[PDB]
Point group: D2
Chain length 393, copies 4
């Protein structure tokens, strides 16, 4: 419960560097120098750091300034050994992206935004990032009439497929991860959840290198079960990255420490990333990225406390989830409840639809009332998970 | 604002026949005979009626009883001319489906449930239904540990692909529509929204004849924009059916009359079904199905009032949405706001990613501050839509 | 973690007795005989039992049937030693109550509902109940014009003042507890949250013996912090009873076991009930009542299992919350965050507004930016708390 | 639909002046000079203007700067005739207020916050404001152990009683209006809803001149019915001010124009404000204040457009709500649904509880099932209302 680099905890530069400006107030902390960020995270046990183009390099920066910033940064990474596993672009802060990057009603802003992305892919390759995240935060509307809904999706597809074709063309070993979000900053964002995101990728021409980057808080903002949406992404072989934080209900994006929102949910999230599926199946072996914000009420000691907290929470949940699954009481409760039974195909090997229709024991002579008497024992099984969680077993 | 059969208003037998039992009380109305339902709906201007297998035919019914019920029903349809455009199966009422049909932890219940579906497909063909709806209402969990998340999806796929292969095999001209729902009756349902549903179909073997059946209320239960989710379904060419009702917020499934929930949203929903996309694209020309419930406080006069209300609301919204789009002030407001501009591809014909990166006017020499000065005028445009809605223009 | 009568765990007859019918399906369990409920609950460690008049005595019961049923139930209580601390009135399942009891639009119904309550006060008094709970579940509307909102609150007051007047008159030592609920079964219910119930009580003629019965899931259905709510009820000394359960978000009411919802909020509710306020103040001493429903997926072993899960959940939280406040590291963290500092009055002993305004050091020469440097360290206090919750420290 | 000063449309300086910075981006508009705001608003038909102390006078303003600024603003008011009906205090943007003003854990900060309020009361009185608004935006927490909840309410009371005491002492005719808000910017805010604010007021020493300022979007953020909320405030005669805007669901605060959110609820709020209660009762006569923000996508033409949209929205709703209640068909529908019947007291003139209980016809021989046959016809009353809303009848 001391993190180490094979744990693969990655942190975004914008998280610990978030100085505290919210919509009702100014920053409460001084800016965090990025070299200092790299040194402080390496020391806490982080494996890597991620950033947005404008997190390191100002929008305004001249070529010389860009060279100077990147040199110090590269030096810092070298001194520490921190990797840079994911890179992303800021397509939401400057006033020009008031109506989006890629789905901006203005065509000249869509070309600028797509060029901001291609340049960033080149920097992403250079850094040795394996994933390029795309968070379309300003793509949407506040009013139903603001957009042509089909055009938005065509413009979004265009953007994404041009970027993907460009990776392919240059031979970069980079994958694109789209990060779905319900709302905020727009009152409605395009591809609001994990399924919209997932569905969207199947319409792309270069879909093969496009996957997702779900975020705890984002699904929770539409009241979805985070464990069930990552399950589906994994199931489809599209869980390319993951962002973990906490959220307490449907409200503004809180960005708390992982485990400080919905704890029981955090627990089962960690059981799926760590243990996978009960009957076997896919596993996610990428980085465990923390995309959160150190509460504005706290000074810099709280920033480093908060960074430590993320990794601690994940490790506490991991031991509890490993003991839980190892527990023989839990394994037999799982058996009773039919967890392993769900793993069995419904049809017998070689059985056809006509075969089952016509099988008298599966329908005509099936006793539905007897079958309804089964005690699934889901509460008891729920109860065992929580007793494991509470460290009482 | 007198409905007629080319309007294609279809009503489910369970809507007007809903006698009023909620989780806190008993029915407040007497049962509605299904022949009387057909006669009363034909007379109100409905085009068709839909039903769940157990809405017409009791679970218990002997073959003779099934023959007798279907004969009277068929007679009624013949006497009136009402079609039966969609059929669906009850996989959620009997105690046997306490943990689902298709994703039931018990394998014997999954075989029964799939056989209940194949038999129903045969009845669906017989009735001349073009769509077979599948609402997986009991597929999910209340506890994160109740299921093996990957197995659930494999079991769901198995069910759905067996049913689809069986349509194909028998040569029925029937399509399957899955209806996504966030929650209720389960605390979390599998394929909770339109994207999960959409994503899910791309993993199926018989995906080609599988599409969606979104419902106003269902998306609204996860706080999504209904117009933007049907837009995406349409965009993907998967909007096979549609269910319209009203819902006032994130809470239990209310099932109000279309236009009695979120009115402005209802309005833009009707603008998309009726007018389509501003720059052109797909159109939805299937039935406009009302899946709602006549409030339990009201007697039978309210049931028929409520049925009339659905069609009235849709026709009032339709005229307001046609005037709105015809309005030359509105067309020029759309132009200013860049609604048509979104229709233009981002890249020039023949332009490549390298071409745009390297185009100095799109990036390097792009004036982002000048571009940020643009007045999108989205509020004014929103305001014009509402003045059209209020019948003030 | 073995409950004893000393713990004051009370259960509603309706909870273990809930047979499984929900809006989409029939009962999955057989009716529970009340004598068995009493016997079962006494073997688990329950302190008492509570009921609604129609949980015990059927709506259409003859006089002979009523006495048999009470002879049976009084015998059971006598045999087992269980107490009956609370009694409530079912003003919701019979179709007569579709528009409410007390705020029904029909005056004849308001008279019957209130008659039904007065008779029930006699019964409650006879049983030795100390609390009389009023849950106005059908009090509200689906539509904004259905009700005259000032007249609904006048009617509500009349009902509550008549019942309280009657208690005072008859010399019964009963206190009325109003149970606020935002929705379900009505689309909007009168006196939606703790706040609303408390405000209403202050408009009552006999508000001195009228307080609240907050329920965990009801407040979570509005997105409110359950703990902030009962704190406010406590502070006004109006916390007369409490109903504990689980709710996983804004959706239908789940009625999960306590701690099977929002764990961390459950942990903080236990802390408040057990440890009181950090700086002292009123404490809650009534029954810890569980109003939940055994999931319908579970048979009768599941029912006694979930009844036991309420009590184990609570005892495990209590143990952690006691360990939490006793930790010296936590006591120190609390001092550091200003938790005890909030207890010191803002003004000085006999300081006036005018004295405060001209004091130079409090305003005029107050260094606002120096003050703003304080690291409140709330993340670290939060992290310690979860660490005590997880049985880690 | 041309507003006139007689309409009492008031606007906050912060609303038209909002420059566009949100959590994900910088300002998209230039600062608005306050003199121009005053002039612009008087040309649109505004009756008055309201501000926060720091909207006008910068936090670090010298004495010389403060007088210049007030000379400029007083001149503008004089020139245009605008009134200043409400003044409020910014106890939220400066980093000193990260934990609150009045309920900050730091005692030195509580003293400065209250000093800052007292000084602002003098200013408000000087300006001729009738209402003093208190919005405790930083009063709350992200974490359940950050605060002693009884001590936070004691501190809050001290602050409000000190300010009210001061008003009384100085002979100013100002009334305090507390503005409840459930969240944002804190994860949970003290006095979350109308209900909570009203309950708190009754625990105050000087609660007689302390009332509420409900805001439309704040209540919709909890899923509450805005109309039920102000009705309850009205009924207790505590509706001192109102803030009108739009909110599309439980998500961040949108601050859309009034009627650009939930239309039908907007329609029913106008009806209540204009027509009062169907059976009579208190009526609201203060300013109709708009606290919204011009979407950041819109330039300055958009700003004056949205200021005008507030007033047109309201005037269009008012016209429909007046037409609605005057319709004979609607008056009849209301009688039929029992709307006036709710106004008749339940008991008879000098009827006691005891008299009611033994009356055979009210209980004992009351035919509950005959009573339950009444068709309340709420769907048809709702349908008439939407038809008047849509300018259809
Ligand atoms: Mg993220
Ligand atoms: Mg449906
Ligand atoms: Mg309760
Ligand atoms: Mg406000």
């Amino acid at each position: 419960v001391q993190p180490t680099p094979a744990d693969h905890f990655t942190f975004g530069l914008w998280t610990v560097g978030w100085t505290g400006a919210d919509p009702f107030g100014v920053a409460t902390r001084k800016n965090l120098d990025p070299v200092e960020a790299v040194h402080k995270l390496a020391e806490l046990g982080a494996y890597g750091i991620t950033f947005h183009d404008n997190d390191l390099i100002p929008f305004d920066a001249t070529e010389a300034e860009r060279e100077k910033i990147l040199g110090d940064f590269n030096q810092a990474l070298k001194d520490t050994g921190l990797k840079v596993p994911m890179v992303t672009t800021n397509l939401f802060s400057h006033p020009v992206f008031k109506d989006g990057g890629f789905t901006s009603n203005d065509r000249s802003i869509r070309r600028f935004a797509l060029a901001k992305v291609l340049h960033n892919i080149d920097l992403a390759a250079e850094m040795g990032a394996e994933t390029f995240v795309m968070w379309g935060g300003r793509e949407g509307s506040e009013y139903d009439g603001s957009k042509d809904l089909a055009a938005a999706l065509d413009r979004m597809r265009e953007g994404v497929d041009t970027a993907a074709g460009y990776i392919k063309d240059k031979g970069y070993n980079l994958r694109i991860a789209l990060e779905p979000k319900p709302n905020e900053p727009r009152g409605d964002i395009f591809l609001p959840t994990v399924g919209h995101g997932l569905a969207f990728i199947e319409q792309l021409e270069h879909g093969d290198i496009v996957g997702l980057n779900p975020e705890t808080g984002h699904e929770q903002m539409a009241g979805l079960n985070f464990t069930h949406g990552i399950a589906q992404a994994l199931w489809a072989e599209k869980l390319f990255h993951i962002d973990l934080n906490g959220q307490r209900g449907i409200k503004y994006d809180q960005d708390l420490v992982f485990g400080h929102g919905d704890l029981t949910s955090a627990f089962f999230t960690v059981d799926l990333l760590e243990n996978g599926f009960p009957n076997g199946g896919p596993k996610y072996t990428g980085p465990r990225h923390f995309d959160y914000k150190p509460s504005r009420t706290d000074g810099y000691d709280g920033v480093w406390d908060s960074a430590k907290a993320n990794m601690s929470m994940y490790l506490l949940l991991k031991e509890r989830a490993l003991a839980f699954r190892a527990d023989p009481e839990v394994q037999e409760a799982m058996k009773t409840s039919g967890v392993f039974e769900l793993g069995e195909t419904t049809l017998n090997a070689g059985e056809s639809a006509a075969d089952l229709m016509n099988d008298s024991a599966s329908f005509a002579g099936f006793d539905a009332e007897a079958a309804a008497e089964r005690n699934f024992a889901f509460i008891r099984l729920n109860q065992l998970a929580i007793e494991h969680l509470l460290g009482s077993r």
